[PDB]
RNA sequence: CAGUCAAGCGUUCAUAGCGACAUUGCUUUUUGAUUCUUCGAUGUCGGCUCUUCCUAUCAUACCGAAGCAGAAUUCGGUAAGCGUUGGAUUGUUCACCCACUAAUAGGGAACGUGAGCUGGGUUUAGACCGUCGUGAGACAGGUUAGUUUUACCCUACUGAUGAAUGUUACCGCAAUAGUAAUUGAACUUAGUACGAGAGGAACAGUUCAUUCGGAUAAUUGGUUUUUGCGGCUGUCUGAUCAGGCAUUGCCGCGAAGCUACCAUCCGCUGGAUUAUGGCUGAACGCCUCUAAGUCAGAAUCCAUGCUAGAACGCGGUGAUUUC
RNA sequence: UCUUAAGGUAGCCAAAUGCCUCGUCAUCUAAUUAGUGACGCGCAUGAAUGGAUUAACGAGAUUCCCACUGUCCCUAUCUAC
RNA sequence: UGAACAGCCUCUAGUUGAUAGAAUAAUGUAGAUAAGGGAAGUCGGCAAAAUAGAUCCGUAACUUCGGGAUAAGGAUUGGCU
């Protein structure tokens, strides 16, 4: 039951939920809410979305 | 003419009529067979359904795909405060059936149970069981004759019990009254146990234990008037049909010139007392100690209650029981648990359960964090906290 | 089947055109017949993450058509839940050519393959890439 | 459709499986014969949806017979508890083809069902083609389009109140009435029994799975009037913030509720019996499952279990109006 | 040779015209009484009682293909009245 | 706004006239949404949905040379300087 990391924003995957969507080359992405998966669906490019832990380390917010 | 394409019938022919129950608390119609060799104990308990969470257990069954491996399932938690015995009922056996011989009650009656006999408590004069308490003044001889009568006659003896409702988050203030039947020992032993427990409370640990088969009785949730499509599950009419499509196209034939009772018809769905068989107890918790939601593998200091408490019910502070699968009835609905009548040995009942992980996340949406410490650690400093 | 695969969740019913991913020359598979199901009035038989399903091709090799012929599906589109508790759904519903026993007509499949398919018929798992 | 006889098929051999030449019957799911009911009017085909009933039983359960070595297959008995599909063409009822499964058994209920629906055909009026007829017109010959009205009243059903038995409230019993679960695959058995080999099991244990039913929404999807938030377009309030309208202005996320074999859990064992196989035992000094009694035994019946509780079935218990 | 006028010429077709017919062959399909192209001793096609191709067009009828969608698998939810 | 007297909002002017209120059950009338399949339902793509404006390249068979044609099929569309 070890916790995973979300593949869109960066979170803590607890057993029970998650989406894969794969790619074809088997990158194996894991999401945590419908919001994150839906945001990935239209290629929102999580290099620009704001409220992100990925942004929390990239944009140097809350260090 | 014969049916063009035969199909299985819709709905059950053993659950009619689908009508409202006579009381909010579903009554029990069967009790475990009495064996006068075991020590006397209760065969049923009362509890209010609180909610369900997610737990992780071990899949231990030879022949399965994975052995000694993790798995997830749903488990319903019911808040069952310890019950207080207020009397016993002696049932004599007659050729026409069981008959109630006599009833004996306690000297001191709590306000919660006494409120059950009143419909307007504030306007009432609280003159309930007043002259009855005078029977115990001199030596209590007013019931010793009745006690001897219950000892001699009334081969079937059952104990009348009530719950303490001031310890639950529900703002109801009226104890629910049900009937509990004694199994084990002789009639004299059962009545002695009943009389020695007068004005006393008993814990749920003495009536239920881990790794047993437990059945649940409760009334379901009503939904009002509903057409046949969801009440029974019949095929809806096509779009091109006239005067609507959500009904039964044919309800019978010319002969007989009446509508068949087995024909699905629009009516009431829900709020029916229902019986759930083979529910497995996973763990029984105590309300007087912490680590309710902490297991041996996961020693995180947390309680069974999720973030912000259970939805529409509140928090858990008394004894709670979590059982595999869904329980009939919605939250805050009274559920009276009943032990398994038949000794199901088989293989699905002898396994040993070992809880690993307890989900205490926010069920009020899509919460992730389990404990405030984890949320603070992953969240850092805030603006609200100075 | 040398194993009892779990509860079936549908999503690939009869009348679906699904592509191919092996090296037999087949391109797309047209679902026409499914066994392992039962009988129900006005219920269209469907498929799941790996079933013994016959089909026919609609585009591709001129000789791989015009006859009923068995096939095996390796990828689905509807979300699938393993008992450990995970909602899995592959991007495109794809499958592999097969004989009634489970033998190969091509050489190797392309792309990933479900672990349940590996626990099923083993010869497709033999000539597979990554399994997940 | 089912019985009787037997010249024969079955390498020899009548009932393993068939049986000509004939005969005795069965129901009205075909079509016939009459017109007794209806022409001051029973809405006429087919299909969709749905309930129940019958056995002349396709499969499941339990058994018997076979030229039954296994498997497979054929016939028969108890048997309606349960199931009996999805699709190309045709309006089709019929018929044919593809595939599945245990198999896709045969029928009725005003040729079930139009104040439930569909309107393709038939079966008005328009119009075309071919034949007959000088002709208007006919064609159980072909094609196209062609308004399918109404329930509020009575009964019945689904549910829901309800006065009266001293009132009220609680705990209750249980006559009645319904009932539910069905079926298959895989590992071990076992490449074993059997068979020479090719071939090839069954009963226990386990994993489950098809359909159906009862519940609940923790998890996932859907639903957006939470109009909750954010963004966008046209117009208006001097501009900004904050804003109105565009019949819910649009999009993304979207809490709660609801719901989804598109989600989860669950669907019990005791007795008595049918078919049939057995014991003792005469009639019939022997034999005999039967005449008396008696054993085992089916998805059969009844109880264990569940649902509603006679609103004129019943029991116990608290207080029962100082005015 | 005949009652007479000669016995269907050029064209077309199981076509809206074919009872036999779900005629036969090829193609479309896993499967087609559907569609298209041919075969014609064609009950009963046929040249101004007019035959064919027809360029463009038809709220005319039918068949096939791509995206599409609750028509369906399999039903669920919201709104105003 | 906008190619437009298309659709929408506002100015002058006119109206606030359709018996009302509280509840939000089924079945209904009207408007939409539904993961996967994509016509497998139905006599029949019936209804709904799908592309829809402007700019740039290109646009087939046939033909009476006029058409098919917006054929089919590809890229862009905001704001500020």
Curated annotation (Swiss-Prot), chain A:
Disulfide bonds: none annotated. The modification Phosphoserine is found at residue 7. It comes from the Eukaryota. It is found in: Cytoplasm. Belongs to the eukaryotic ribosomal protein eL24 family. Present with 247000 molecules/cell in log phase SD medium. Component of the ribosome, a large ribonucleoprotein complex responsible for the synthesis of proteins in the cell. The small ribosomal subunit (SSU) binds messenger RNAs (mRNAs) and translates the encoded message by selecting cognate aminoacyl-transfer RNA (tRNA) molecules. The large subunit (LSU) contains the ribosomal catalytic site termed the peptidyl transferase center (PTC), which catalyzes the formation of peptide bonds, thereby polymerizing the amino acids delivered by tRNAs into a polypeptide chain. Component of the large ribosomal subunit (LSU). Mature yeast ribosomes consist of a small (40S) and a large (60S) subunit. The 40S small subunit contains 1 molecule of ribosomal RNA (18S rRNA) and 33 different proteins (encoded by 57 genes). The large 60S subunit contains 3 rRNA molecules (25S, 5.8S and 5S rRNA) and 46 different proteins (encoded by 81 genes). This is Large ribosomal subunit protein eL24A. It comes from Saccharomyces cerevisiae (strain ATCC 204508 / S288c). The chain holds residues 1 to 63 of 155 of the full protein.
Swiss-Prot record, chain B:
GO terms for cellular component: cytoplasm; cytosol; cytosolic large ribosomal subunit. Methylation at His-242 by HPM1 is required for proper 60S subunit assembly and promotes translational elongation fidelity. The modification Phosphothreonine is found at residue 102. The modification Phosphoserine is found at residues 23, 155, 296. Keywords: Cytoplasm, Isopeptide bond, Methylation, Phosphoprotein, Ribonucleoprotein, Ribosomal protein, Ubl conjugation. PROSITE patterns: RIBOSOMAL_L3. Disruption phenotype: A mutant confers resistance to trichodermin, a trichotecene toxin produced by plant-pathogenic fungi. It comes from the Eukaryota. The modification Pros-methylhistidine is found at residue 242. SUPFAM superfamilies: Translation proteins. GO terms for molecular function: RNA binding; structural constituent of ribosome. InterPro entries: L3_arc_euk, Ribosomal_L3_dom_3_arc_sf, Ribosomal_uL3, Ribosomal_uL3_CS, Transl_B-barrel_sf. One of its GO terms (biological process) is translational elongation. There is a cross-link at residues 38, 135 (Glycyl lysine isopeptide (Lys-Gly) (interchain with G-Cter in ubiquitin)). It is found in: Cytoplasm. Component of the large ribosomal subunit (LSU). Mature yeast ribosomes consist of a small (40S) and a large (60S) subunit. The 40S small subunit contains 1 molecule of ribosomal RNA (18S rRNA) and 33 different proteins (encoded by 57 genes). The large 60S subunit contains 3 rRNA molecules (25S, 5.8S and 5S rRNA) and 46 different proteins (encoded by 81 genes). uL3 forms together with ES39L one of the contact sites for the signal recognition particle that targets ribosomes to the endoplasmic reticulum membrane. Belongs to the universal ribosomal protein uL3 family. Present with 450 molecules/cell in log phase SD medium. This is Large ribosomal subunit protein uL3. It comes from Saccharomyces cerevisiae (strain ATCC 204508 / S288c) (Baker's yeast). The gene is RPL3.
Curated annotation (Swiss-Prot), chain C:
Methylated by RKM1 at 2 different sites, but it is unclear which are the 2 methylated residues among Lys-35, Lys-101 and/or Lys-105. Coiled coil: none annotated. GO terms for cellular component: cytosol; cytosolic large ribosomal subunit. PROSITE patterns: RIBOSOMAL_L14 (PS00049). CDD domains: Ribosomal_uL14. The modification N6,N6-dimethyllysine is found at residues 101, 105. Keywords: Acetylation, Cytoplasm, Methylation, Ribonucleoprotein, Ribosomal protein. Component of the ribosome, a large ribonucleoprotein complex responsible for the synthesis of proteins in the cell. The small ribosomal subunit (SSU) binds messenger RNAs (mRNAs) and translates the encoded message by selecting cognate aminoacyl-transfer RNA (tRNA) molecules. The large subunit (LSU) contains the ribosomal catalytic site termed the peptidyl transferase center (PTC), which catalyzes the formation of peptide bonds, thereby polymerizing the amino acids delivered by tRNAs into a polypeptide chain. Its main location: cytoplasm. The keyword Acetylation applies. GO terms for biological process: cytoplasmic translation. The keyword Cytoplasm applies. Pfam families: Ribosomal_L14 (PF00238). Belongs to the universal ribosomal protein uL14 family. This is Large ribosomal subunit protein uL14A. Component of the large ribosomal subunit (LSU). Mature yeast ribosomes consist of a small (40S) and a large (60S) subunit. The 40S small subunit contains 1 molecule of ribosomal RNA (18S rRNA) and 33 different proteins (encoded by 57 genes). The large 60S subunit contains 3 rRNA molecules (25S, 5.8S and 5S rRNA) and 46 different proteins (encoded by 81 genes). There are 2 genes for uL14 in yeast. It is found in: Cytoplasm. Gene3D superfamilies: Ribosomal protein L14 (2.40.150.20). GO terms for molecular function: large ribosomal subunit rRNA binding; structural constituent of ribosome.
């Amino acid at each position: 039951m070890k916790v995973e990391i979300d593949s869109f924003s960066g979170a803590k995957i607890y057993p029970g939920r998650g989406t894969l969507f794969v790619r074809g080359d088997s990158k194996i992405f894991r999401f945590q809410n419908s919001k994150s998966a839906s945001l990935f669906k239209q290629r929102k490019n999580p290099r620009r979305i704001a409220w992100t832990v990925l942004f929390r380390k990239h944009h140097k917010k809350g260090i | 003419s014969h049916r063009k394409y035969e199909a299985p019938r819709h709905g059950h022919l053993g659950f009619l009529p689908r009508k409202r129950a006579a009381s909010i608390r579903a009554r029990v119609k069967a009790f475990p067979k009495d064996d006068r060799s075991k020590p006397v104990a209760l065969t049923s308990f009362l509890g209010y359904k609180a909610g369900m969470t997610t737990i992780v257990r071990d899949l231990d069954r030879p022949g399965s795909k994975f052995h000694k491996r993790e798995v997830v399932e749903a488990v319903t938690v019911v808040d069952t405060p310890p019950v207080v015995v207020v009397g016993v009922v002696g049932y004599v056996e007659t050729p026409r059936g069981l008959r109630s011989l006599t009833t004996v009650w306690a000297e001191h009656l709590s306000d919660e149970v006494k409120r059950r006999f009143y419909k307007n408590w504030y306007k009432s004069k609280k003159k309930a069981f007043t002259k009855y308490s005078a029977k115990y003044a001199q030596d209590g001889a007013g019931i010793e004759r009745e006690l001897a009568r219950i000892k001699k006659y009334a081969s079937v003896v059952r104990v009348l019990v009530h719950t303490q409702i001031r310890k639950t988050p529900l703002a109801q203030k009226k104890a629910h009254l049900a009937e509990i039947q004694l199994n084990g020992g002789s009639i004299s032993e059962k009545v002695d146990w009943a009389r020695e427990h007068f004005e006393k409370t008993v814990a749920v640990d003495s009536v239920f234990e881990q790794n047993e088969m437990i059945d649940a009785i409760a009334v379901t949730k009503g939904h009002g008037f509903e057409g046949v499509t969801h009440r029974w599950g019949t095929k809806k009419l096509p779009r091109k049909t006239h005067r609507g499509l959500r009904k039964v196209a044919c309800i019978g034939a010319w002969h007989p010139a009446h509508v068949m009772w087995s024909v699905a018809r629009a009516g009431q769905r829900g709020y029916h007392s229902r019986t759930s068989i083979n529910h497995k107890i996973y763990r029984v918790g105590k309300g007087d100690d912490e680590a309710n939601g902490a297991t041996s593998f996961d020693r995180t200091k947390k309680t069974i209650t999720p973030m912000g408490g259970f939805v529409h019910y509140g928090e858990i502070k008394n004894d709670f029981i979590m059982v595999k699968g869904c329980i009939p009835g919605n939250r805050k609905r009274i559920v009276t648990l009943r032990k398994s009548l038949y000794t199901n040995t088989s293989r699905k009942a002898l396994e040993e359960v070992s809880l690993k992980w307890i989900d205490t996340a926010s069920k009020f949406g899509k919460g992730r964090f389990q404990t405030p410490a984890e949320k603070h650690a992953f969240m850092g400093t805030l603006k609200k906290d100075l | 089947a040398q194993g009892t695969k779990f509860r079936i969740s549908l999503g690939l019913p009869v009348g679906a055109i699904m592509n191919c991913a092996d090296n037999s020359g087949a391109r797309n598979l047209y679902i026409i017949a499914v066994k392992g199901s039962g009988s129900r009035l006005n219920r269209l038989p469907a498929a799941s993450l790996g079933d013994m399903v016959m089909a026919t091709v609609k585009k591709g090799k001129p000789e791989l058509r015009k006859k009923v012929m068995p096939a095996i599906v390796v990828r689905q589109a509807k979300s699938w839940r393993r008992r450990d508790g995970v909602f899995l759904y592959f991007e495109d519903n794809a499958g592999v050519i097969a004989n009634p026993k489970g033998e190969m007509k091509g050489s190797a499949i392309t792309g990933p393959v479900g672990k349940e398919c590996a626990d099923l018929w083993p010869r497709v798992a033999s000539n597979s890439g990554v399994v997940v």
